[PDB]
Design a protein around this motif. Structure first.
Motif, PDB file in Angstrom:
ATOM      1  N   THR A   9       0.844  -1.196   0.000  1.00 55.34           N
ATOM      2  CA  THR A   9       0.000   0.000   0.000  1.00 55.34           C
ATOM      3  C   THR A   9       0.873   1.236   0.000  1.00 55.34           C
ATOM      4  OG1 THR A   9      -2.051   0.887   0.980  1.00 55.34           O
ATOM      5  CG2 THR A   9      -0.332   0.110   2.512  1.00 55.34           C
ATOM      6  N   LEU A  10       0.244   2.379   0.208  1.00 56.66           N
ATOM      7  CA  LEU A  10       0.894   3.667   0.194  1.00 56.66           C
ATOM      8  C   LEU A  10       1.577   4.001   1.521  1.00 56.66           C
ATOM      9  CD1 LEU A  10       0.627   4.422  -2.697  1.00 56.66           C
ATOM     10  CD2 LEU A  10      -1.613   3.570  -1.989  1.00 56.66           C
ATOM     11  N   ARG A  11       2.044   5.219   1.728  1.00 56.09           N
ATOM     12  CA  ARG A  11       2.879   5.432   2.894  1.00 56.09           C
ATOM     13  C   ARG A  11       2.084   5.290   4.193  1.00 56.09           C
ATOM     14  NH1 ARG A  11       1.189  10.306   0.884  1.00 56.09           N
ATOM     15  NH2 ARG A  11       0.387  11.715   2.490  1.00 56.09           N
ATOM     16  N   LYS A  12       2.813   4.987   5.265  1.00 54.20           N
ATOM     17  CA  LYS A  12       2.251   4.822   6.601  1.00 54.20           C
ATOM     18  C   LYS A  12       1.477   6.058   7.045  1.00 54.20           C
ATOM     19  CE  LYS A  12       5.659   1.574   8.668  1.00 54.20           C
ATOM     20  NZ  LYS A  12       5.878   0.843   7.387  1.00 54.20           N
ATOM     21  N   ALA A  56      -5.211   4.743   3.144  1.00 54.91           N
ATOM     22  CA  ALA A  56      -4.903   3.493   2.443  1.00 54.91           C
ATOM     23  C   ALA A  56      -4.179   2.523   3.396  1.00 54.91           C
ATOM     24  CB  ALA A  56      -4.040   3.766   1.202  1.00 54.91           C
ATOM     25  N   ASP A  57      -3.120   3.017   4.056  1.00 57.80           N
ATOM     26  CA  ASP A  57      -2.410   2.207   5.038  1.00 57.80           C
ATOM     27  C   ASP A  57      -3.319   1.667   6.127  1.00 57.80           C
ATOM     28  OD1 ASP A  57      -0.116   1.192   6.538  1.00 57.80           O
ATOM     29  OD2 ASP A  57      -0.385   2.980   7.867  1.00 57.80           O
ATOM     30  N   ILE A 101       3.067  -3.933   3.545  1.00 56.82           N
ATOM     31  CA  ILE A 101       4.339  -3.316   3.115  1.00 56.82           C
ATOM     32  C   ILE A 101       3.983  -1.949   2.508  1.00 56.82           C
ATOM     33  CG2 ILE A 101       6.421  -3.621   1.688  1.00 56.82           C
ATOM     34  CD1 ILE A 101       6.057  -5.885   3.776  1.00 56.82           C
ATOM     35  N   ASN A 102       4.442  -0.888   3.172  1.00 58.11           N
ATOM     36  CA  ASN A 102       4.210   0.491   2.718  1.00 58.11           C
ATOM     37  C   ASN A 102       5.208   0.812   1.610  1.00 58.11           C
ATOM     38  OD1 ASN A 102       3.593   0.427   5.922  1.00 58.11           O
ATOM     39  ND2 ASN A 102       2.030   1.511   4.705  1.00 58.11           N
ATOM     40  N   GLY A 158      -5.336   3.808  -4.027  1.00 58.49           N
ATOM     41  CA  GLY A 158      -6.416   4.662  -4.506  1.00 58.49           C
ATOM     42  C   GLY A 158      -6.762   4.330  -5.943  1.00 58.49           C
ATOM     43  N   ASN A 159      -8.005   4.586  -6.328  1.00 52.64           N
ATOM     44  CA  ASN A 159      -8.475   4.266  -7.667  1.00 52.64           C
ATOM     45  C   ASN A 159      -7.738   5.074  -8.742  1.00 52.64           C
ATOM     46  OD1 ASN A 159     -10.313   2.493  -6.581  1.00 52.64           O
ATOM     47  ND2 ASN A 159     -12.014   3.977  -6.635  1.00 52.64           N
TER      48      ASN A 159
END
Ligand SMILES: [Cl-]
Ligand SMILES: [Cl-]
Ligand SMILES: [Cl-]
Ligand SMILES: [Cl-]
Ligand SMILES: [Cl-]
Length: 233
Positions: free
Chosen positions: A83-86, A90-91, A106-107, A126-127
């Motif tokens: 996923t994206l950053r912490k 999304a995280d 895993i970010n 994200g879409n």
């Protein structure tokens, strides 16, 4: 006649967050002022944001928004969710989902998420990064269909709710124009990207106390400070 905007109804929201989009599109009609917390740091009378950011503001939640903003890529039985950053929503979503999928999070960044999903892992993005399986639909499968975004202030503000619904109607009826406005104001999405994804969001407001309490409880799994945010109504 500056008191033509309601005094004490200054609303902060991230203009790059889809929670803002219904107010961006009809900004010029609103009887209250809006402010971009991506570019301004301050105190506001009302805040709209991810529920996971509510502990920052110290306000009381009075309404929620369901928005289908994320896609699951790849194989959920692989043991990893990229996923994206912490600390992004999304995280936090990935960490909630990881319990059910028996995965480690895993970010990373969007390109890495796509690549590793194609290599046989899974990702939550994200879409605007990639279309995949609706995260909203995955959380329905799990019985966890709850609003991930919230509106907060010192009391219920009906005028903000009402405006928000008007903006949802604008988007539904004007995809192209809404996409151009969001792209211009957001400072984040291209018009091309927004035109492709705008119809997926499906913004829906809830004022149902049990749904608000439910989302606070769900997201407190990963943002414990949430339990101390009060819900009004
Ligand atoms: Cl949601
Ligand atoms: Cl990170
Ligand atoms: Cl409702
Ligand atoms: Cl509170
Ligand atoms: Cl409460």
């Amino acid at each position: 006649h500056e008191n033509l905007y309601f005094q004490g109804m200054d609303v902060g929201m991230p203009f790059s967050g889809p929670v803002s989009f219904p107010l961006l599109v009809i900004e010029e009609e609103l009887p209250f002022r809006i402010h971009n917390i991506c570019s301004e740091t301050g105190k506001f009378d009302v805040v709209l944001d991810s529920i996971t950011n509510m502990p920052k503001y110290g306000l009381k939640i009075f309404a929620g928004v369901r928005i289908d903003m994320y896609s699951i890529l790849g194989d959920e039985s692989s043991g990893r969710i990229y996923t994206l950053r912490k600390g992004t929503l999304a995280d936090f979503n990935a960490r909630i989902l990881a319990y059910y999928d028996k995965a480690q999070v895993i970010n990373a960044d969007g390109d890495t998420c796509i690549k590793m999903a194609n290599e046989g892992y899974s990702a939550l993005v994200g879409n605007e990064i990639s279309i995949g399986k609706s995260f909203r639909n995955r959380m329905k499968e799990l019985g966890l269909d709850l609003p991930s975004c919230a509106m907060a202030s010192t009391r219920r503000i009906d005028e903000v709710i009402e405006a928000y619904e008007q903006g949802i109607d604008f988007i539904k009826n004007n995809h192209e124009r809404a996409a151009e406005i969001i792209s211009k104001k957001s400072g984040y999405y291209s018009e091309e990207v927004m035109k492709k994804i705008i119809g997926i969001y499906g913004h829906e407001v809830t004022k149902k106390r049990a749904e608000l309490v439910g989302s606070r409880e769900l997201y407190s799994r990963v943002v414990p400070e949430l339990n101390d945010i009060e819900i009004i109504g």
